């Protein structure tokens, strides 16, 4: 048994990259002990450092990389595999030769294992690696793999000093030609990787040429990254802050804008210490954000707006906003959040910081389905594509913080990292690439790490596709798209509480039933969309439909979802389907027709809400029953009532002696 | 100036029959003076009787028959219109020429009036007539009127004596041949005719030849048989009784005959005076007679039943039970009624009888029509024919006792005229005329009449037309042709004064309604309707529908009539037309199907009536509405519920515990 207190690992580092740093947490994750040179090139570094070990025939010493590398192993398996290798100085296998491709004939022939060598990794007794290593005396321009090549070609100097190549991976293994052949192997508390091909367990993992990302990927686990028992690694679960600069992008048009900058007031952060950058392409959202704007730049430290008159491609506003950052000092972090995010969170920019990442992006999944701000692998036109773990993260089966290619619509990158690690101007504009594919390419290309985290809740993304913009009020039609949004403003804020129950709903007469729908914004868009369309009208009534305005799939939608469980909760054993042909609002002002003759509904059940305040707006009479001696007296703008439309319930319309009346209505189940 | 004292009013009359008292009443209000002679032949009498008047030049004398005449003016009209003729001795005129016809050349032109004579009636001198009268020396057999004939023809002698003839009726109006030329007309307190053909109005009207009937109408006001303003001029309007024969007859399956047989109990008359006769030619109706006739037998003085086991055609029947009559001293009136005649009032038996006719009949009506128990008039066929005052007649608008040609069903004969006036038996046979027709014209042929009295509502008439027989119980599909009494026997006492108000009808729950709609005796003929069929069967029941029986349509028009009204009086503002597809029947009995889980139905409204007792026929729960709280424990038979069968009255059927519940269920205004 060789004692591990006598091997070592070296490895070559110009800087302490995140790639590195990941290296290095494996080694001491088991407790290895690296010797990192430089705090071809780097034969000329190891040859120097074998000069001290060049009698230590005690001593088995491993060379890989470290930007590329993960170890998945321990030291005491790792040196008893190498004894049962039988060679003196064990080299990585690979499914390609180069550079010089000719020299396949060269190699032994290998039955079913892979054939040629790679330079990226290799164990041996430290006086066989020196009497190797110390033979280079080349340029630093020339590679490495054509050194230890031709030297492993040389059959009798393959003989003399005992030369292999790990030909089944036992110890290496080299991504590159071999991607369907590993997969990951999971634990209580650790993880690590297998090759199929072989069944064998290796100890180093190198993603040599294009398979950064499939090590990054792997990274997230092996060795310790995430555990089935005990979760994330390295993410925290469990006085003044930074400055940062928010830069607000609203590059189309999207819904619920106004909601949006008045939720910007909101985040749980001082806002002293915020700096607002907004840029908006859009004429349509300049009348929402110059009416929060008031209230923003009284909010944070500074603002400053690029409306749609510099005419910016979204590339160009992207740059421009990030650039403040960069060539700002005192701007520590950069947190630049699209239009179309919604964060139900409210610490997100906190706990991103606190997470002490470059670049760090909270996940966000439009509600209910699996499309994300963040893609789990590339194809190899670096399109889209779908990652072994996609839907686990998606789904939050797996969380914690991930090393992932691709981040958009909301992230938070430090400052340092503009300033000394990317600081040229084009990272988003500069080539027909699109400005949020070509800014996760900039930082890939250098080498850093784009980290998502689903830890928490943060929020969700808003369906802007299709978002017809030839309305008064466009957020009315979007009830189908982003319905979870669309109750936020237009259901009644006690709506939900009502339908648990809570005493709230009460019974004014005889089996008519009040209950709070709409909110009163819902009220006030929805008969300034009757008014705009101005062309009003067997008892007959002043009244408009909403199928002439183009406005009935929306409320018989609304109907379907809310008053259909509102009905077969307060009348136990009826079931419905919110079937309507009548749906409408009335009007009721002295002018035409003030009041209602009495009559029934052809229907089951009939809606009424009302649109607008009681001693206000008009004032009047509400609902008269005349066979129960009861009326409506005042009626609330945001509630309705239940009643049925036909036999037991003859209604009449008391008069409105001053004012308008806005009342909804539709004949539901005929 | 005449003195109205010297003229003398000569008849003949070998009877006091009804047509000569009518006479002698008409001459009485005039208050003429009436020679009747004997209480050709009769010239024979009048010859005798002129020779004391031979020498009397002062005196006017007028002729006429008594049976077939009637007085319509004074004598003072009448004297001075004799004066006006300028003739000693005027004769009536007539349209045809008899005995013999050849004599018509003999008669003088006349230009548009009547030209031959008539012996029926003449007024003139004394010393005129008896120079005329006293040359008769001829047999009794020879008619009188050959003898007064050629005599007028005589030139000489016409012109000797002043011998005239009444050419355009200015007092005398024969009947034949002027029918269409005689009127009435009106007055305060007085009727009389008009000849329209030569505007007169005629002092004596005589119906010659095949005119009797037509007297007999007009005998009914002329002169004061009925007035405007006084009515009637004979009739009644404002101590032991005599011994009557009560005469039932049923010659064909007639309707609610238990309902006639217990109405027999009723009539208000001693009943030890009453003698019951009851003929059935039906088996159909043996059951029905058999269950009465311990009661019949109790209550009259004498019953006797003639089965259908003799085969007595009904001329057979209807003479020996007014026979039977004849035949006995005792018998003093004689009341013969259909088994199709309804006597609302109980007194018509006393009544007819105080009017003091030979022939008296009750008026009666089917409810709605014209057709009734009596002919105004008869066709040259003697087959039916309306007369100019048969719809006042039955109507009532012209009211009193009135000479009618024909009378069934119902009538009350005096028992002296049976045995001196009418002693055969061939009364109602003996030809192949109807036996109705026969009896009405063996009465006119003997000149007796046949009174038709309207003075008071009698009853009705039953529709026995298609009465189906193949029913366990007929008399329920009898909803169309009999309705009024059909509600008297189904339809429950107290509905009536239940839609009126009265405060009957109860609210058990919030909005369903408790009345009751049906009668005891519907019920147990609706069950065992149902368990004739035997064949009982989304919530599903052990049913048996109103249509597979074939009583769909008789329930709906139960819908139409009691139930539609009964819904709109207690919702006011709803409106009902009784519409139904699912009728049908429900039994409830713990060995198949005890009870019925909550459940709404498709329809507007329900109406769920009992059908049996509770606590008698079976003992369980009743009908609960749970959204209420409220359960109806004790159900009442005849009484029927009203509730919304949708969305507000989720109802659960409670379990029977023993015996069997059924209950009638109609889902109506789906
Ligand atoms: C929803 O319900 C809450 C409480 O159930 C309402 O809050 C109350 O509002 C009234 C008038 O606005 C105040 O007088 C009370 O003091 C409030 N109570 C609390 C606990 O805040 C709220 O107004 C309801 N929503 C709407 C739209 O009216
Ligand atoms: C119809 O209503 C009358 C009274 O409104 C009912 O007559 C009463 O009947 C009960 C029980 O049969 C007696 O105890 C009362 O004494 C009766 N009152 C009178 C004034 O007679 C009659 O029963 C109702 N009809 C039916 C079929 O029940
Ligand atoms: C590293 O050392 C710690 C404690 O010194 C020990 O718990 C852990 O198991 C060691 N790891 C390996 C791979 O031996
Ligand atoms: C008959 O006499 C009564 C009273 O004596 C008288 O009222 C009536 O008018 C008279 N009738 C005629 C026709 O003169
Ligand atoms: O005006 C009201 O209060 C009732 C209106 C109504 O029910 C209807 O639209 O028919
Ligand atoms: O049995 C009852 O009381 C209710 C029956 C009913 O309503 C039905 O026929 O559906
Ligand atoms: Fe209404
Ligand atoms: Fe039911």
Redesign the interface.
């Known amino acids: 048994p060789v004692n591990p207190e006598k091997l070592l690992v070296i490895t070559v580092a110009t800087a302490e990259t995140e790639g590195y740093l990941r290296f290095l947490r494996s080694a001491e994750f088991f407790n290895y002990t690296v010797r990192t040179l430089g705090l071809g090139q780097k034969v000329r570094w190891l040859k120097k450092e074998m000069e001290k070990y060049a009698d230590r025939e005690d001593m088995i010493i491993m060379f890989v990389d470290s930007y590329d590398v993960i170890l998945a192993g321990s030291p005491t398996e790792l040196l008893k595999k190498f004894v049962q290798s039988g060679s003196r100085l064990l080299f990585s296998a690979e499914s390609f030769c180069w550079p010089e491709w000719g020299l396949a004939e060269q190699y032994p022939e290998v039955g079913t294992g892979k054939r040629f060598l790679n330079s990226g990794g290799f164990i041996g007794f430290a006086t066989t690696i020196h009497q190797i290593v110390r033979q280079w005396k080349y340029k630093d321009d020339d590679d490495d793999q054509l050194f230890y090549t031709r030297l492993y070609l040389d059959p009798g100097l393959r003989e003399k000093l005992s030369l292999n190549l790990d030909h089944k991976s036992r110890i290496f293994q080299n991504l590159n030609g071999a991607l369907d052949e590993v997969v990951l192997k999971f634990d209580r508390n650790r993880v690590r990787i297998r090759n199929v091909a072989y069944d064998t367990l290796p100890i180093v993992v190198h993603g040599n040429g294009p398979t950064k990302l499939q090590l990054n990927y792997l990274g997230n686990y092996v060795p310790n990254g995430w555990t089935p028992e005990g979760g994330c690694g390295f993410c925290n679960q469990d006085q003044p802050p930074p400055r940062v600069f928010l830069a607000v992008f609203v590059e189309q048009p999207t819904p619920f804008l106004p909601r949006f900058l008045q939720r910007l007031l909101l985040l749980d952060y001082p806002p002293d210490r915020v700096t607002l950058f907004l840029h908006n392409n859009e004429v349509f959202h300049e009348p929402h954000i110059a009416d929060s704007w008031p209230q923003l730049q009284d909010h944070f430290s500074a603002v400053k707006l690029v409306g749609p008159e510099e005419a910016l491609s979204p590339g160009e506003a992207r740059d421009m906003a990030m650039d403040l950052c960069r060539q700002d000092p005192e701007c520590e972090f950069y947190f630049s959040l699209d239009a179309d995010a919604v964060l139900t969170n409210l610490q997100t920019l906190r706990i991103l910081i606190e997470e002490n990442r470059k670049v760090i992006a909270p996940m966000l999944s439009r509600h209910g389905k699996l499309w994300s701000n963040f893609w789990g692998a590339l194809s190899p036109d670096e399109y889209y594509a779908r990652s072994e773990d996609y839907v686990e993260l998606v789904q939050r089966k797996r969380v914690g913080v991930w090393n992932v290619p691709y981040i958009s619509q909301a992230y938070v990158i430090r400052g340092d990292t503009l300033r000394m690690e990317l600081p040229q101007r084009d990272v988003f504009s500069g080539s027909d690439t699109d400005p949020d594919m070509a800014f996760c390419k900039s930082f890939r290309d250098k080498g850093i790490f784009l980290h998502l985290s689903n830890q928490h809740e943060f929020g969700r993304l808003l369906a802007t596709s299709r978002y017809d913009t030839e309305h008064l009020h466009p957020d009315l039609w979007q009830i189908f798209d982003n319905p979870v949004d669309w109750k936020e403003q237009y259901i009644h804020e006690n709506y939900s509480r009502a339908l648990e129950g809570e005493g709230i709903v009460e019974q004014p007469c ?2 008519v039933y009040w209950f709070p729908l709409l909110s009163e914004q819902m009220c006030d868009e929805l008969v300034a969309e009757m008014e705009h369309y101005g062309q009003w009208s067997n008892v007959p009534t002043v009244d408009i439909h909403m199928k002439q305005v183009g406005y009935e799939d929306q409320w018989l939608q609304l109907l379907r979802t809310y008053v259909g469980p509102m009905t077969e909760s307060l ?4 079931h419905t389907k919110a079937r309507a042909v009548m749906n409408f609002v009335v009007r009721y002002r002295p002018d035409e027709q003030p009041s209602l003759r ?3 509904d052809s229907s ?2 009939t809606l009424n809400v009302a649109l607008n305040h009681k001693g206000l707006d008009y004032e009047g009479g509400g609902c008269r029953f ?2 129960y001696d009861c009326v409506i007296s005042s009626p609330r703008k945001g509630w309705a009532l239940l009643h ?1 439309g ?3 319930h ?1 209604h009449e319309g008391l008069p409105t002696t001053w004012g308008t009346r806005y009342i909804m209505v539709s004949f539901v189940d005929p």
């Not at 009348?571 to 009826?574: D, V």
């Open positions: 005889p089996d009348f136990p054993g009826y009495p009559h029934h089951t059940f005349l066979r049925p036909r036999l037991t003859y």
